[PDB]
Amino acid sequence: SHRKFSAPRHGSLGFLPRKRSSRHRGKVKSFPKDDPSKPVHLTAFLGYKA
């Protein structure tokens, strides 16, 4: 009680559901917000690490 030497706690609790992903292709959680001012473009690609 009162651990007498406060340590920074290991790991991060924000990444807690550590899990094999349901998909091995990495899906995009969110694309950036559009504006009607810019001309038409894309925002993503697939790639292969070499």
Partner 1 sequence: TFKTVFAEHISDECKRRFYKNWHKSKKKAFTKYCKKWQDEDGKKQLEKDFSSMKKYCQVIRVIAHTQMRLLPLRQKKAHLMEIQVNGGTVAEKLDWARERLEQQVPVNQVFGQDEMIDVIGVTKGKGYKGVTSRWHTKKLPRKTHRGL
Name the DSSP letter for residue 42: -
Under rule CB under 8 A, residue 28 binds partner 1: yes
Under rule CB under 7 A, residue 4 binds RNA: no
Amino acid identity, residue 12? Answer: S
x/- site string to RNA, residues 29 to 48, per CB under 7 A?
Answer: --------------------
x/- site string to Mg ion, residues 8 to 37, per CB under 5 A?
Answer: ---------------------xx-------
CA distance 14 to 1: 26
CA distance 29 to 45: 14
